[PDB]
Amino acid sequence: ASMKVLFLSADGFEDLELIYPLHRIKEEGHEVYVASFQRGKITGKHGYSVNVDLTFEEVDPDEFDALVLPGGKAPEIVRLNEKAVMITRRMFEDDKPVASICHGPQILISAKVLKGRRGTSTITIRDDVINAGAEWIDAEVVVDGNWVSSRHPGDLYAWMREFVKLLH
Amino acid sequence: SMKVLFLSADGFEDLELIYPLHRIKEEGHEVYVASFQRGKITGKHGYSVNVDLTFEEVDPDEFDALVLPGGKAPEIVRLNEKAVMITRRMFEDDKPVASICHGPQILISAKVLKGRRGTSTITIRDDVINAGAEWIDAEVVVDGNWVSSRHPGDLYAWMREFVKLLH
Question: What GO biological process, any one, is recorded here (chain B) (predicted)?
Answer without folding.
Answer: proteolysis
